[PDB]
Amino acid sequence: LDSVVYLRIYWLGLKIFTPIAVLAWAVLVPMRFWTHIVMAYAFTIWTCYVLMKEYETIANMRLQFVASEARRPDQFTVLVRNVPPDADESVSELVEHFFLVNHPDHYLTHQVVCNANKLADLVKKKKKLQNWLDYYQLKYARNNSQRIMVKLGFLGLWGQKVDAIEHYIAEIDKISKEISKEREEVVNDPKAIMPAAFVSFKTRWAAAVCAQTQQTRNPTQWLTEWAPEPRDVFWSNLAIPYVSLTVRRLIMHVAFFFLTFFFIVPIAFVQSLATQGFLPGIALKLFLAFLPSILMIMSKFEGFTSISSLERRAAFRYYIFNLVNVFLASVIAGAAFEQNTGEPRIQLYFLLGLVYAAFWPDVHGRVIAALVISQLLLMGLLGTKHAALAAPFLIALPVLTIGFHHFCKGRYEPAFIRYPLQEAMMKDTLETAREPNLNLKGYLQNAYVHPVFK
Amino acid sequence: TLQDIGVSAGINILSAFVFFIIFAVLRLQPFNDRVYFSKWYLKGLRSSKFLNWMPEALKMPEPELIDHAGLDSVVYLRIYWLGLKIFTPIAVLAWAVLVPSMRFWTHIVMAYAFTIWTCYVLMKEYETIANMRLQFVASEARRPDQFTVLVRNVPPDADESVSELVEHFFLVNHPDHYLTHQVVCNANKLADLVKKKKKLQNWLDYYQLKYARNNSQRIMVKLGFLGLWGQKVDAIEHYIAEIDKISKEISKEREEVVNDPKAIMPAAFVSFKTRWAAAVCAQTQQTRNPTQWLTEWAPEPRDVFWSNLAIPYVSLTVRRLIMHVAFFFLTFFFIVPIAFVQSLATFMKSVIQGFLPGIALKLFLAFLPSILMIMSKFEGFTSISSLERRAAFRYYIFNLVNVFLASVIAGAAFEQLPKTIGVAIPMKATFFITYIMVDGWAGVAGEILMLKPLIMFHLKNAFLVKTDKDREEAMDPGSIGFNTGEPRIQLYFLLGLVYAPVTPMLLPFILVFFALAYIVYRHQIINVYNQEYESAAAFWPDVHGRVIAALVISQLLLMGLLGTKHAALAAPFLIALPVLTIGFHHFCKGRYEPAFIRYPLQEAMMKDTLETAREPNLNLKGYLQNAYVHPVFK
C-alpha cells in the first residue's frame, strides 16, 4: 500500500544494482577475495535487514488494517481430505459420526464431494474435445492436416473417426443417461463417492479450531484444511490417492531442479563453444514453448485443491526459472561481450530498461529466492579454485539467509493467518447481534456441491 | 598400533571386572542399601557368581518397565538397542567385504547399503516409539498439565491487573471451557533467601553435632582455612544470629512480594475443564499479533523451572544470541586441551602413553555438562525437560566439532611436527578406539558403582543427620541424565558410521559398548535413578535428527576421502546419498513427528469421555486451582 510505495523508491535501486555489481566488479578488478566476500556479506546483510524492517512495518500495517467483509462459505467450512475408507459405512456416515463425536455442539452439516473423478474426467474431455473438434475443423479448413493421436495417443479406441461428429454426439447422449443412472446409484452406493468432504460449522471459531489442529493419531487421514471458495475449489485434486503430499512435494522440488539444470546445459555448451544432425534446429525451435503451462500442468499433476494456489505455485516456479535463465545467463553473456498483474510486468520492464543502463509474504519469498540464487551461482562461479579450503567457512551464507527467512517465517507470518481465535469469536458475536434470525444451516448446505450438479 | 589396542583392551576389561567386583561387594552391605536400591524406596516398596544382576536386569519386560520407571527411561534405553540394530549388520558386512577400479565400486556400494539399512532401522524405530508414546499418553493418569496451558507475554494495560486481563480474555474467547487461571509471580529473591536459610541450617546442624561430639568451642572463621580473621568463638551463636536475621528477611520478603504489583509477570497458567479445550488453546493461533498471548502446553508443576519464568519475554532472543557467542568462544578456547591430548599421542611404558590420552580427554570434558546446563539456564527455558534437550543439542555440537574434527585436524597437524583428510581420518582410528574403550567400557562399568552419590550419602548420614525419618531426604538418586548420556552415544554413532567404510576394525568396540551400556543402564533404571520430570519420550525427534546428521556427515566425509582418486565419477553417486537421506528425513519427519509435536483432538476427546464415564463426580477446580502457584508459597 502506501508503505510499499514509499519503500519501493529505495528498493528498486538496490534491486537493479545488486546482481550487476557482483557480476562485473567481481571479475574486473583484482585483498582480492577478502574484499569480494566482505562486500557480498555486506550487501546480503543489508538486504536482510531491509526485509526485516519493511516486514515489521507491513505486519503492523496489517494489524491496524483490520476490516470486515460480509460473509462467505469457507468462513465456516473445512476440507476434510483422505477420509479412511470403511466397508461397513459410507463416506457421509463416517464424516457425520466423526464430526458429531469429536467436535460436538458446533458442527452443522457436511456436503460430501460426489465421485467426481470419472465425472470431472468426462466433463473435462467433453469441454476440451468440443473445443478440439472446433479449432481442428477450422485448421483443416485453413490447412488440411491429419493427426495421428486420437485423444489418447498410446491406447486409444479402435475406431475410424470418419465423421467424429455424429458418433461423438451419440456418445454424449448415451453418457448423459449414464450420468443419470450413476446419479441414481450414488445416493445408495458406498463405492461411488470419493473420500473427501466439506464440513460446515455453526461458527468461524469452530472452523478455525478445526483447520489448525491435528484430528487423528494418523497424520495422513482426516487431513483437514481451510476450504476454498466454491468457485475456487479445483475439483480434480480433492481425492488424490494421497501418496503422502510431503513425498509429492519433495518429488516436485527434485523434478523442477533437474528441469532447470537440464535447460541450463544447452546454454552452457553454447557459451563453452563460443568462448541427430538437424534435430538441434528443431530443438531450438521448441525451446520457445508453452513451458509456463508445462509447469502449471506439472504441479496440477500434484494436489492443491484451489485454483488460486495452483496459479501461485506455477507463477512462482516460472518466476524462478525466468530469473535464473533469461536473466543471469543473459547478463553474464553481456559482460562477456563487453570484453496483481501490472506489478510483475512493471518489474520486468524496469529490469529490461536497466539492462542497458497478503501478497507481501509471497514477495518476500521471491526476494529471498533471488538472493539465494545469486549466492549459489556465485558459489559455482568462484569454486573453480582448487584446494581453496575456504568452503567450510564461506558456504554458510545461503544457510544464513535461509535461517533469517525462517526467523521471518516464525516471527511475522503468523500475522497473516486466516481467523485467529479472537477475531473469529468477535466476528461471531457481532454477526449474531446483527442477524439474530439467520438460518445459517440452510444458507451453507447448498454450496460445494458441484458446478455440474446444478 | 594393534599391540597398543590389545594392551588397552586388557587393561580396560580388567578395570571393568574390578569395578563389578567392588560393586557386588558394596551392594550387599546393609548400611548402604538406601543407595544401590534408591528406587524401590521412592516407590515405598522396600524398607530397611558375582554377576547375577546382569541377567536379573533382563526380566521386567517393557510394559512393566514402563510402569516402574516411565517412558523417558524406557525410550532412552531403547537408544542402545537402536545402536546394536544399526551396527551389527554393518559390522558383519564390513568385516566380510572390506577385510582380506573394483574396490572403488565396492566402497560405493558399501556406503549405499549402510545408509539404506540405517534409514530403514530409523524408520521402523521411529514408528515404534510414536505408537509407544501414543499408547502411554492415552493410558496415563490425571495430571494438572493435561488441562493447563502456559500463556506468555500477556499485553500490558494501564489499569487492569494481569489476572483480570487473563480472566476476561479466556472467558470471552473460550466460553464453557475455561476453568481457572494462576498468574506467574516473580519470587526469585524469596526463593533465594529460602535456599540460603537451608544452607545455614545445614551448617548449624553440622556444628551442633560436632559440639555434641566433643565439648569445646569451635573457632571456624568464615571460610575454614583462609577466610576473614573472624573467631566465632562459639561458631554456633554466630549461625544462630545468621539464621534469625535470614528468617526475619524472609518474613519481610514474604509480606512484600504478595502486595507488590511489579512482582507480577505477564504470564499465567490457565486451566480448562477438558483436555480437548486445552489442546485447542495450546495448538491454535490466539491473536493476530504474533507476539502477544503465546500459548503452549504447560509442564507439570514438578517440571517448571520457576527461576526463568520471571524473564521479560522480549529478551529471550538477546539471551540466545549471547549464549551462541559464548558457545562459540567455548568451542574455540577449548581447542587447546584437545591439541594437548593429541600431543600426548606422540614396553608397558609406551602402552600407557597410548592409554593416557583417553583419561586426559575424559577429565577435561567431565565438567562440560555443567557448563552447558548453565548456558541453557541462561536462555531461560521454563522447563527442566527443555533445558535438558537444549543442553544435549549443544553438547552434541561440541562433540562433533571438538572431540572429533578437532582431534582429527590437530593429530594430522602434529604428525607434521588440498584434501589431506583422506589420510587425516584413517590415522585416528587408533585414538578413537582407545577413547571408545576408556570412555565407554570402563566409564560405564564405573558408573554402576555410584561413587559420588554413595559418598555424599555417607557424608550426610555421618555428619548432618540429626534424627530418624530424615534419611530419605539424603537419598537423592538423580535422573538418567539425558544431557550426558545421550551425546556420548551420538558421538559413538558418528564414529561408527564414519569409520565403517574406512577402517572396519572400529566397530566391535562400539558394539561391546552398546551391549554393556544397555545392561548397566537397564539395571540402574530398574533400581536407582528417580525421574525428575515426565515427558512422554518427546526427545526422540532430536535423537532421530542427530542420527540423520551423523549419516550425512559420514557420506560427505567419504566423498571427500575418495575424491582424491583420479577420474572420480563419484559425484553422480555420492551427491545422491545426502540428498536421498535428507529426503528420507523429511518423509519421516512429516509422517511420524506429529505424534511428538501435536496432540490430536480425537485422542483428547476419547481420553476425556472415558474419564468422565469412569469418575463422574470429579471436582476438577479443586484439583487444578492450587497447582502452579510456586513451591515457595507452601
From Swiss-Prot, chain A:
- Compartments in which it is found: Membrane
One GO BP? monoatomic cation transport
Record GO terms (molecular function)? calcium-activated cation channel activity; identical protein binding; mechanosensitive monoatomic ion channel activity
Gene Ontology CC entries for this record: plasma membrane
Mutation: K285I; reported impact is: Abolished activation in response to poke
Q: Does the keyword Membrane apply?
A: yes
UniProt topological domain (Extracellular) ranges:
385-387
Is Ion transport a UniProt keyword of this protein? yes
According to UniProt, the name of this protein is Hyperosmolality-gated Ca2+ permeable channel 1.2
Source organism: Arabidopsis thaliana (Mouse-ear cress)
Gene assigned in the entry: OSCA1.2
